[PDB]
Amino acid sequence: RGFSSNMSHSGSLGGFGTFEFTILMAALLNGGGINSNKILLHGFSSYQLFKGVIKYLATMDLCHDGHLQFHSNPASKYIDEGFQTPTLFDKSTKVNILTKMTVSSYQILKEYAGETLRMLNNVVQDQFSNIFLTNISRFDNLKYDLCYDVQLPLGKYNNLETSLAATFGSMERVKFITLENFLAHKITNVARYALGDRIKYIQIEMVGQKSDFPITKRKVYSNTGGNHFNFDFVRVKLIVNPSECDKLVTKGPAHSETMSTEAAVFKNFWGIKSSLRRFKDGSITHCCVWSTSSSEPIISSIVNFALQKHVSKKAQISNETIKKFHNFLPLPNLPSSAKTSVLNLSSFFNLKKSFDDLYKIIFQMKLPLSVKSILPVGSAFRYTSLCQPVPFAYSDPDFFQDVILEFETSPKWPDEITSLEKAKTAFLLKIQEELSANSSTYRSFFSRDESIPYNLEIVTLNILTPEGYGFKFRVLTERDEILYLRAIANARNELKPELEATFLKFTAKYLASVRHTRTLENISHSYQFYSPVVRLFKRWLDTHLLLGHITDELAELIAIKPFVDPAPYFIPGSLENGFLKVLKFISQWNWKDDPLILDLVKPEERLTLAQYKGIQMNFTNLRNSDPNGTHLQFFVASKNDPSGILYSSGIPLPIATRLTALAKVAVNLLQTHGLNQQTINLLFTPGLKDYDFVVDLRTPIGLKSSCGI
Amino acid sequence: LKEDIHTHMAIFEQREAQAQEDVQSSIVDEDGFTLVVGKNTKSLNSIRKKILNKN
């Protein structure tokens, strides 16, 4: 976790360490409770000692309310207040052993206690390598969510007074060791007050720091890029509550007539920008407008002002990765779309409104056999499509979303499979006939579909909605499932697995696809960065040329895997942290001894021990029948598909090995060269490789104004 | 495709009604053996395949 016992007062993640761990274990030996109830006995070994330790650290605060007391010369209890710093009192010394690290470092360590406690107390699966044997401290943006680098060219210790706007006082040099110390404590307090309910946790870490200075020299005598203090530039690492990133108004206290001290310090901290406003509720409250841009998250703008207003007036901020991929996101032709966020879903809601008026006008009419239910299954209906869907945007091949519709269980149906799918075409003929009869402002046509093999006579009904959208309609019946099963049963015995593959494609296209889009569309409103991480993953995967084999639901499942199981990390509060968590995981991931079980559940209906063991057992016999992954490479199993072979089927071994190799090359580049603009451009290079074949294709028109990006 | 699946349904229902009427009209054997049949079954191939699946 990166917690060595050096110091976090000097601006580095650490301070807590191994003998502090010893001291709290032996302090919890003789009690721990408020009545000194024995937290730790040596009746249980290191595993339950460790579990009780993490339980006590996660359920017993030290910073702000309560901390441990003990005296070595002798019970140990839990006193009630907190000293606004990590604290535990040892009265036989009168010392505060946890005052080597700071408030945010203790805060993030209590979070790590809670998180590893959550993934340790469960009796479901085993994750010992997930909890120990992966050094999460290797990368910055992997254990953190986003990063800023403050470059402060202060010049000299005397040039301070016109190069930086911070304090310079006896009262700060008496409590802070040096320049990096007072700027560190000032910058963590102004980041805390600037964001507050805008981020999960802040960690400050001055890089270029070193505890190294030679024999001949009196000090660190080092030109640290515009100063001579032991740090080069300031890592400002943020992990964010992702539900309030792009909320464009933060709120101070309201307006009394007597302008009290909280509104006072709010107006001092925010200067000319923030003011008191009316709202639709009618409250008169202190706030400030944050002009949201697409490429820029407003978290960078608020930290830019909280840097360039208080600690310096000419220092500058380095964060270019977010804007570097945010134009790799495709920007749709929408009104003020540059000022729209990436966490805005107004395009998907616009087609959902168009779909709902279509839904009403297809329910309010008369068939010879009424509608049981229609259910959209589209990638836009699960927030995944690469165009953020603008009306009239034909050039995207998934412009036409697909909606399954099923009538009621009439036992009048034709028998053989071509006849029943032709009867479904007959129903679609009737529905578009009445559609053009009554509401001719919608238009329509028919298109053959061959995404299922060997059924030659299956068409879909495509409609063009005058709000400007296009929907496929595929009729499902209660009969096609048992028709495919009895076709399986009476087929010739050397022709079984191909018809089984046909039925698997049918199940993936019609049946399990509905609960698929239902579950992850329901969970995307709890994991808010899901649609941007899948959209950037899919554009990465098409630049590296895999979508012609892999399916989009499989790419969607590989991208939900770091969200519904993010342990040991956080859920990703930013797009970069999501994307490199994806690629780090799939570079880690094997196939031969590695399935992929995920439960698409809400945080804090799940997958229990029995279903887990059944999934692992059919995986086990599946790939002892399959020796090394000759034709079955991945295994993605959810609650909605305990088979796991539904989306992984069909992809060739060169494509799957190319994906895993590209992931390992990407994590190699990440740990070697670091993040940069040319790093991200090399991460989106085609990797064309000149493997035997290159064609260059250009249709006689350009199609981005027509696709709407 | 209107007239196409019109002709397809118009031959399908013809051979279907013919098959079902042939099923439950009367089946005596070469000797006297009236065949047991369902109330609403439809094909000799259907009862053949279900008597195969109940092997």
Partner: peptide, 10 residues
């Protein structure tokens, strides 16, 4: 009524 003849039997 070609489509009605196609949608008989139901």
């Amino acid at each position: 009524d070609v489509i009605e003849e196609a949608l008989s039997r139901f």
